[PDB]
Design a binder for this molecule. Structure first.
Ligand SMILES: CCCCCCCC/C=C\CCCCCCCC(=O)O[C@H](COC(=O)CCCCCCCCCCCCCCC)COP(=O)(O)OCCN
Ligand SMILES: CCCCCCCC/C=C\CCCCCCCC(=O)O[C@H](COC(=O)CCCCCCCCCCCCCCC)COP(=O)(O)OCCN
Ligand SMILES: CC(C)CCC[C@@H](C)[C@H]1CC[C@H]2[C@@H]3CC=C4C[C@@H](OC(=O)CCC(=O)O)CC[C@]4(C)[C@H]3CC[C@]12C
Ligand SMILES: CC(C)CCC[C@@H](C)[C@H]1CC[C@H]2[C@@H]3CC=C4C[C@@H](OC(=O)CCC(=O)O)CC[C@]4(C)[C@H]3CC[C@]12C
Ligand SMILES: CC(C)CCC[C@@H](C)[C@H]1CC[C@H]2[C@@H]3CC=C4C[C@@H](OC(=O)CCC(=O)O)CC[C@]4(C)[C@H]3CC[C@]12C
Ligand SMILES: CC(C)CCC[C@@H](C)[C@H]1CC[C@H]2[C@@H]3CC=C4C[C@@H](OC(=O)CCC(=O)O)CC[C@]4(C)[C@H]3CC[C@]12C
Ligand SMILES: CC(C)CCC[C@@H](C)[C@H]1CC[C@H]2[C@@H]3CC=C4C[C@@H](OC(=O)CCC(=O)O)CC[C@]4(C)[C@H]3CC[C@]12C
Ligand SMILES: CC(C)CCC[C@@H](C)[C@H]1CC[C@H]2[C@@H]3CC=C4C[C@@H](OC(=O)CCC(=O)O)CC[C@]4(C)[C@H]3CC[C@]12C
Ligand SMILES: CC(C)CCC[C@@H](C)[C@H]1CC[C@H]2[C@@H]3CC=C4C[C@@H](OC(=O)CCC(=O)O)CC[C@]4(C)[C@H]3CC[C@]12C
Ligand SMILES: *[C@@H]1O[C@H](CO)[C@@H](O[C@@H]2O[C@H](CO)[C@@H](O)[C@H](O)[C@H]2NC(C)=O)[C@H](O)[C@H]1NC(C)=O
Ligand SMILES: *[C@@H]1O[C@H](CO)[C@@H](O)[C@H](O)[C@H]1NC(C)=O
Ligand SMILES: *[C@@H]1O[C@H](CO)[C@@H](O)[C@H](O)[C@H]1NC(C)=O
Ligand SMILES: *[C@@H]1O[C@H](CO)[C@@H](O)[C@H](O)[C@H]1NC(C)=O
Length: 1395
């Protein structure tokens, strides 16, 4: 262009721009105008940097759409900066140094750094809660910078004058407000209301000024909620309907509790007597807290139930409805808002076992079914809908992003330059003197022989460090030191030899030699610091050598790639998430700081845990709520700082954090992706005995053939199969009567043992019959038969032990409990579970491959924890007071309080789950990674002190970092890898079989395909006209939208009528509610009667006309007739369900929805795939429950085991199994069955059965719980995958070819033109000149018409061309094979053919 601007340069366009409206003007395509936006390099025209053209305005070489008067300035980085040049009043001019200077500062990047040097410093000064008095001065300094920035920007573009001003960018005006207060509070009397100074922590958003990557990623994040639509509508609808159901059932059922026994007035007025003390009235008697009872082992209140299956409390107590609600009164069902909150808590899967147990105890066990109905509809499907929608949105965005560049692309490194001469002294390190040593070292260091050897020396070391535990003697330390020294020596020898073998110049090639160098030097320098002092965690980083297997293991490379992609390639989302967490923590602390000082009030300095008085605790609470535990802290709030603030803040942070984490997870996963039967057997050992092919003419030859034919005929009958299935079902079901009450029932044991004998009899006979039927092919080549063989063998050895009378040997009794595998025979009879078990068994190797690396990555942390927390958990306690540690002032170590054990009331004890060895470490890590029971482990860890020393309250605070790091690493990337592997394997299996799904059989295939068909339209008018007047003035209103609008208004009014319900009120509410309900029922009945003669009997179609009838009118008249009895009202439990059917009137609005219909269609699509999974899960639950019934029958009642939740009978065991199947709390069940001490168990107990003791053995319980958890996780993953696959597969419309009626118009016109008979003929010699001008372009060109001479055309008469066959071929081109519209045309031609 030019070196500098001239005054007359812009005149040529200024004299013409203003006349565009009249002279300039007298196909628009609004486009980005060939890219060329700000903050980009964009080398496209020249591609060569200028010499000294930096920091000057340019002539705006750009399309006129974005030129006007603006100009572009570039920096040394060629950053495009646009500035519109217009008059700014005063004496200012676009060509004046006061603007040249501002532009030159704005374009330059230096002051950019300045900004980044300021705000981060602010982020430190803002994190203090007790600032020093002198920091005020520093505050001014900060302001004295920020305003500067704003000033320069104004000087470049203007304030708000013409265009492209400082206030046109959305990100700009945010800083404006930051300036306001920066000059306001200094010179104004502050308002009466304080705590407004928390606005300052919004300038952290200014961090989005670091780079454009933050801006584009924020735009990407915000460009997903618009796609995410109507899914929240469906979620709100489901939550509302479930809350409405829940209100009608458990209303006022959370106040039940039992009080001590009453006594009559005993004369006088208003005087209730009890144990010699008199109370004034009933209100003041039922409200005193002393008159209640506490559940044993906990500081809570017991609840009663009047039903036969709701529990009770001991004698001397009667249960009534009085008092306040449990948990400070924030959980209840009295009103709609609390019910909504409880249902939302149930959706999130927060601590819901508490509410589960409370509701079950108060109302009854039979109500558990209700919970079974919510989880399946609230815990999985809505979450999966959200997941699938966001995944589709992200995939579409990435597809568009890559397609943009795909379309677009089609259409020095030596700063010092002084070390090169040093290379003249390098490389040639062999020196002029010759040596044969180098050749020898090069030869001996050869990969396929020595390298494997070194690998061995790495594995054993990993085991050698694994030998760390409690209570060793000096020998173990000696061996550990010797082994460590030997391994370090061998490593240093390898290094020294390798560097001599391969020249130092080539040594640093891939960086793994660098890794070896740093690990060797670190190990040596750690070995050097081994004296009396300087002892620390000497593992340091020598555990890193475990990763050196990366060469030999092609699986850990994927984990390394994922970890690497977590930084750099996708390194901006982590920054955004960190910024969000930081700002949320700071705002929470600022808001809720000075409201926790009143919560101690005891023990002279006992501060409750999880507070917000400091930055660290706020960060911990933010991390915890991100993990998925928020209700407990919300309860701690809302009683010290208000109720309408914590709710909003917590909901906002939860939503934002979950969205960000989920998007990061998806992005990382996608990046990581980037007739004789066979006689005996084959021709094997037959060379020794060809004794089968013998004379078949005599009896010895014919008998075997006849018998085998007979057996083949016998096994083929269906009656035999049904008999066997019935026997299997009965045998499986007969094991439910083995509870603790079997001894009392004298007349059931004999029947049970007779059945036990008969089952084995029939099974052995059946097995032998099949054994003689087929041959030796089965039981040895078929997979299914081996299981039956093994079970029959177990039963056979059991029966031979029983019959011989030697069943009192001992370990023989162990096989008796192994009968719980009997129900497993039903895994091959129904088609059913066969497909799902096949799919599950076809994926084992991938699971093993992932499991190996998982165990290694947890073993490293187990070793670290074993070192760091060895023997720091013991404490001695006073038995009478309970299980609380005393103090450090009196008792300090074990010796002191073992010397104080004079009267026999001090007991030393250690936590159930600890870190005393590697196995306990594995158990603790499994407990932590599932977020169940981690609180006790964390509390013990923080409470730690010296070796076997008594704990000190919060002595080692900074040990939360280890657990935070573990949760970040081991619970996120391993999950990503597992999900990716499973998805890859499942998709590969899907591609292998073909275009057919896996979890479906033939019958379900037929149903799926048949009901998939869509498209059925029939808007006929079968409306008679007895008199056009009377019906003609109403049917017009019927057709208009006014009718349906009034209908939805009536539905909404009914919804708001059912809105208002609470506990007992005055009758004036009840009467009004009943009157409104009656009016709405009346209007609905009238509405349904308006049908009358409007549609006659022609309305019985697929439309929603039977649904509303049968759901609304029959149910409402039934309920109202049940209510008008007016004689008596017994069994209110049998009364609420009657009016529960009124909720069916709220489900009619779906008919007029938009996407809810499609999502319900997805439900209907998916159900068959979930049926089989449910069947398999139920079978697994049954077998595990019957197995567990026989081991934990007489365990002590403590912690998570109560009288209503135990293993003493079938129903309670099933309830516990349902509770645990979602990993909803199993520490409380594992703890009681783990203890084995005389302080907590009595080995001598008068058990009703021939057994001793009161507690079991953990060695079986640990396996019992672990295997069940693993199996449940694996099955739930399969359900998840099937649901999402179906949901994102049904998102398609395509075309079903429904338009075929308007096809014969052209043919009718042609016939009317030439011959109206539909049987005419044509000739190509005339066609080539006749078929030239045709409208409705459904025809072909003239050359293409000639090719139709021998294209599906019979030859009749003198080589004439049949028109009807041409019509059939033409209609067959699109869909002429089956239909309802073209079928009439084909039938018309066929009928014309007849005559
Ligand atoms: C950003 C929103 C832009 C909205 C504009 C859309 C295109 C409209 C083009 C046809 C109408 C143009 C009329 C026009 O410019 O009139 C002018 C008034 O225009 C307006 O009402 C809007 C002026 C916008 C200037 C920038 C204001 C920014 C406000 C924050 C956004 C003339 O005002 P006047 O000299 O007092 O004359 C009063 C009697 N007319
Ligand atoms: C899943 C992997 C787990 C396997 C089972 C782990 C332990 C099973 C029981 C073996 C006995 C045991 O734990 O003894 C403890 C095991 O001793 C060890 O340190 C063994 C180290 C094995 C490392 C395996 C990897 C020792 O306790 P002590 O009080 O020192 O005697
Ligand atoms: C830039 C964003 C993404 C992260 C910002 C977080 C850190 C840069 C901040 C948060 C808390 C800050 C700490 C808060 C408190 C202290 C103690 C302070 O000195 C004291 O010990 C003061 C004692 C007292 O509190 O009275 C020195 C700074 C330091 C370490 C701060 C250093 C900077 C920290 C780690
Ligand atoms: C205390 C008060 C004054 C705070 C007010 C803040 C909002 C007015 C700001 C803060 C963040 C801004 C958003 C940050 C990022 C973007 C992306 C940006 O995307 C684009 O430029 C793409 C084109 C388009 O979205 O139309 C559009 C503006 C928007 C939504 C901004 C709109 C204005 C927002 C909401
Ligand atoms: C980063 C920011 C934007 C997060 C959101 C903060 C505000 C929405 C919060 C911070 C302080 C809050 C206020 C703190 C104290 C009170 C007093 C409280 O009751 C009174 O004492 C009312 C007295 C009156 O109205 O005169 C009513 C809510 C209110 C105004 C709060 C309203 C909500 C506020 C402004
Ligand atoms: C905290 C300490 C004790 C352990 C972790 C230290 C890491 C921050 C450093 C140490 C060694 C570094 C590695 C040393 C050498 C290289 C080779 C280097 O290779 C290249 O530059 C070329 C890559 C290619 O071949 O394509 C890539 C980075 C990498 C793996 C480095 C990645 C970062 C590492 C692991
Ligand atoms: C490693 C990540 C996960 C920490 C996340 C929070 C950090 C940004 C902040 C929160 C509180 C900060 C601590 C607050 C006070 C101290 C005390 C003081 O250190 C000590 O007295 C020695 C103990 C140590 O440095 O670990 C200075 C650093 C430290 C640990 C700070 C280090 C940085 C911490 C952990
Ligand atoms: C890198 C991988 C392989 C493991 C990561 C583990 C870290 C999260 C651990 C290892 C060493 C730990 C540190 C080891 C020692 C200390 C000193 C400790 O200080 C006290 O106990 C002070 C109390 C007092 O003596 O008065 C506080 C925890 C801290 C910083 C630990 C914080 C957590 C660390 C960094
Ligand atoms: C709190 C912990 C225990 C739950 C962690 C569950 C998620 C990490 C899993 C469950 C369902 C998974 C999704 C199921 C199906 C698909 C297939 C595919 O689409 C991309 C991955 C995705 C979204 C999966 C990503 C990983 C998800 C979100
Ligand atoms: C352990 O608990 C017992 C029971 O509370 C404490 O004994 C109390 O004090 C003396 C003995 O110290 C007894 O005579 C009293 O009967 C007990 N109760 C009360 C209310 O005083 C005992 O002191 C506790 N501590 C130790 C170390 O034994
Ligand atoms: C109940 O007794 C009180 C106190 O003696 C008395 O004032 C009151 O009138 C009595 N109420 C009756 C008798 O209804
Ligand atoms: C503690 O309460 C439980 C609850 O069932 C009861 O069984 C037990 O007997 C109580 N303990 C004592 C010592 O009475
Ligand atoms: C306590 O009251 C209940 C109420 O049903 C009664 O059954 C029981 O006998 C009473 N017990 C005593 C000791 O008064």
């Amino acid at each position: 262009s030019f070196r500098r601007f001239t005054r007359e340069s812009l005149a040529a366009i200024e004299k013409r721009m203003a006349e565009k409206q009249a002279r300039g003007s007298t196909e628009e395509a609004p486009r980005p105008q060939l890219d060329l936006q700000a903050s980009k390099k964009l080398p496209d025209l020249y591609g060569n940097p200028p010499q000294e053209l930096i920091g000057e305005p340019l002539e705006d070489l750009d399309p006129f759409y974005s030129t006007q008067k603006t100009f572009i300035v570039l920096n040394k980085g060629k950053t495009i900066f646009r500035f519109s040049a217009t008059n700014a009043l005063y004496v200012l001019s676009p060509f004046h140094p006061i603007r040249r200077a501002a532009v030159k500062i704005l374009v330059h990047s230096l002051f950019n750094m300045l900004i980044m040097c300021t705000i981060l410093t602010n982020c430190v000064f803002m994190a203090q809660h007790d600032p020093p008095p002198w920091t005020k001065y520093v505050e001014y300094t900060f302001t004295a910078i920020y305003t500067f920035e704003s000033l320069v920007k104004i000087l470049a573009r203007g304030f708000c004058l013409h265009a492209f001003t400082f206030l046109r960018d959305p990100w700009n005006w945010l800083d404006f407000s930051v300036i306001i207060m920066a000059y306001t509070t200094e010179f104004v009397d502050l308002g009466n209301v304080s705590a407004l100074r928390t606005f300052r922590v919004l300038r952290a958003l200014k961090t989005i000024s670091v780079i454009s990557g933050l801006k584009t990623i924020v735009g990407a994040l915000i460009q997903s909620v618009k796609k995410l639509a109507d899914v929240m509508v469906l979620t709100v609808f489901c939550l509302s309907v479930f809350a409405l159901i829940g209100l009608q059932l458990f209303m006022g059922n959370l106040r039940h509790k039992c009080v001590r026994n009453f006594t009559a007035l005993n004369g006088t007025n208003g005087s209730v007597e009890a144990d010699g003390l008199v109370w004034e009235s009933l209100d003041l008697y039922l409200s005193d807290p002393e008159n209640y009872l506490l559940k044993n082992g906990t500081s809570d209140v017991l609840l009663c139930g009047n039903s036969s299956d709701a529990g009770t409390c001991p004698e001397g107590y009667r249960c009534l409805k009085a008092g306040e609600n449990p948990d400070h009164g924030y959980t209840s069902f009295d009103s709609f808002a609390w019910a909504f909150l409880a249902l939302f808590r149930l959706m999130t899967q927060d601590c819901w076992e508490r509410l589960y147990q409370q509701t079950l105890r108060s109302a009854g066990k039979i109500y558990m079914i209700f919970f079974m109905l919510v989880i399946f509809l609230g815990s999985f499907y809505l979450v999966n809908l959200i997941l699938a929608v966001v995944a589709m949105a992200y995939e579409e965005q990435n597809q568009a992003t890559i397609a943009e560049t795909e379309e677009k692309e089609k259409r020095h490194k030596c700063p010092p330059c002084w070390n090169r001469l040093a290379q003249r002294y390098l490389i040639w390190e062999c020196c002029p003197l010759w040596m044969s040593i180098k050749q020898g070292v090069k030869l001996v260091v050869m990969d396929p022989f020595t390298d494997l050897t070194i690998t061995m020396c790495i594995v054993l070391n990993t085991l050698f460090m694994a030998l760390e535990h409690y209570n060793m003697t000096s020998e173990f330390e000696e061996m550990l030191q010797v082994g460590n020294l030997v391994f370090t020596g061998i490593f240093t020898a390898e290094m020294t030899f390798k560097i001599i073998a391969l020249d130092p110049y080539y040594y640093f090639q891939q960086g793994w030699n660098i890794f070896d160098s740093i690990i060797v030097i670190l190990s040596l320098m750690e070995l050097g610091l081994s004296r009396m002092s300087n002892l620390s965690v000497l593992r340091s980083f020598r555990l890193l050598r475990v990763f050196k297997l990366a060469k030999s293991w092609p699986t850990l490379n994927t984990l390394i790639k994922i970890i690497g992609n977590s930084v750099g390639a996708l390194g901006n989302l982590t920054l955004v998430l960190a910024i969000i967490v930081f700002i949320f923590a700071v705002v929470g602390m600022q808001l809720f700081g000075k409201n926790y000082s009143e919560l101690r009030d005891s023990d002279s300095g006992l501060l409750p845990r999880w507070h917000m008085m400091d930055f660290f605790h706020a960060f911990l609470i933010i991390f915890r709520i991100l993990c998925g535990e928020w209700i407990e802290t919300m309860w701690d709030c809302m009683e010290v700082s208000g109720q309408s603030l914590c709710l909003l803040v917590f909901l906002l942070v939860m939503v934002i954090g979950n969205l960000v984490v989920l998007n990061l997870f998806l992005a990382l996963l996608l990046s990581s992706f980037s007739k004789d039967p066979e006689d005996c057997f084959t021709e094997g050992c037959v060379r020794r005995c060809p004794c089968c092919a013998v004379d078949t003419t005599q009896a010895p030859g014919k008998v075997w053939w006849r018998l085998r034919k007979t057996c083949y005929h016998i096994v083929e009958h269906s009656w035999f199969e049904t008999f066997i299935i019935f026997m299997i079902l009965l045998s499986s079901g007969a094991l439910a009567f083995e509870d603790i009450y079997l001894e009392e029932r004298k007349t059931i044991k004999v029947l049970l043992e007779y059945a036990d004998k008969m089952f084995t009899y029939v099974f052995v006979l059946e097995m032998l019959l099949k054994w003689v039927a087929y041959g030796f092919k089965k039981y040895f080549t078929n997979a299914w038969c081996w299981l039956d063989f093994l079970i029959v063998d177990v039963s056979l050895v059991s029966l031979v032990a029983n019959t011989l009378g030697f069943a009192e040997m001992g370990p023989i009794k162990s096989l008796r409990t192994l009968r719980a595998l009997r129900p497993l025979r039903a895994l091959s009879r129904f088609e059913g579970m066969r497909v799902v078990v096949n799919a599950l068994v076809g994926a084992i190797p991938s699971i093993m491959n992932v499991l190996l690396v998982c165990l290694i990555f947890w073993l490293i942390f187990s070793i670290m924890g074993v070192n760091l927390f060895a023997g720091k958990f013991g404490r001695c306690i006073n038995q009478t007071e309970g299980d609380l540690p005393l103090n450090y002032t009196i008792v300090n170590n074990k010796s002191q309080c073992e010397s104080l054990n004079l009267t026999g009331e001090l007991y030393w004890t250690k936590v159930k789950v600890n870190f005393d060895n590697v196995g306990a470490g594995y158990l603790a890590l499994l407990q932590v990674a599932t977020f169940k029971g981690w609180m006790d482990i964390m509390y013990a860890a923080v409470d730690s002190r010296g070796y076997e020393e008594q704990p000190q309250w919060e002595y080692n605070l900074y040990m939360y970092i280890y657990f935070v790091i573990f949760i970040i690493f081991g619970s996120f990337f391993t999950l990503n890898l597992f999900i990716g592997v499973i998805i890859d394997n499942f998709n590969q299996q899907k591609k292998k079989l073909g275009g057919q799904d896996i979890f479906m059989t033939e019958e379900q295939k037929k149903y799926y395909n048949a009901m998939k068909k869509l498209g059925s339209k029939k808007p006929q008018k079968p409306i008679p006209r007895p008199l056009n007047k009377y019906q003609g003035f109403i049917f017009d209103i019927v057709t208009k939208q006014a009718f349906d609008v009034t209908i939805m208004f009536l539905i909404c009014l009914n919804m708001v009528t059912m809105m208002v319900e609470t506990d007992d009120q005055s009758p004036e509410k009840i009467n009004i509610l009943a009157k409104i309900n009656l009016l709405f029922v009346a209007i609905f009945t009238g509405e349904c009667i308006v049908k009358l003669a409007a549609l006659r009997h022609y309305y019985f179609t697929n439309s929603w006309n039977i649904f509303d009838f049968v759901v609304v009118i029959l149910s409402i008249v039934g309920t109202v007739l049940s209510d008008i009895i007016q004689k008596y009202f017994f069994s209110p439990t049998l009364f609420r369900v009657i009016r529960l059917a009124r909720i069916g009137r709220i489900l009619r609005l779906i008919r007029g929805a938009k996407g809810i219909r499609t999502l319900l269609f997805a439900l209907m699509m998916s159900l068959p795939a979930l049926f089989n999974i449910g069947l398999l899960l139920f079978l697994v639950m049954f077998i595990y429950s019957i197995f567990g019934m026989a081991n934990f029958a007489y365990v002590k009642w403590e912690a998570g085991i109560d009288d209503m939740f135990n293993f003493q009978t079938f129903a309670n065991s099933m309830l516990c199994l349902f509770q645990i199947t979602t990993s909803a709390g199993w520490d409380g069940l594992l703890s009681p069955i783990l203890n084995t001490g005389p302080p907590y168990c009595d080995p001598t107990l008068p058990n009703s059965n021939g057994s001793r003791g009161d507690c079991g053995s953990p060695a079986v319980g640990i396996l019992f719980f672990t295997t069940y958890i693993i199996i449940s996780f694996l099955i739930v993953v399969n359900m998840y995958i099937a649901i999402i696959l179906e949901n994102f597969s049904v998102a398609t419309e395509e075309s079903t070819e429904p338009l075929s009626e308007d096809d014969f118009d052209m043919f009718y016109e042609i016939w009317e033109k030439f011959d109206p008979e539909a049987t005419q003929f044509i000739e190509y010699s005339v066609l080539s000149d006749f078929a030239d001008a045709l409208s409705e372009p459904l025809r072909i060109a003239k050359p293409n018409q000639i090719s139709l001479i021998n294209m599906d055309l019979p030859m009749v008469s003198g080589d004439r061309i049949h028109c009807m066959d041409i019509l059939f071929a033409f209609t067959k081109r699109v869909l002429g094979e089956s239909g309802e519209m073209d079928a009439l045309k084909i039938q018309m031609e066929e009928k014309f053919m007849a005559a």
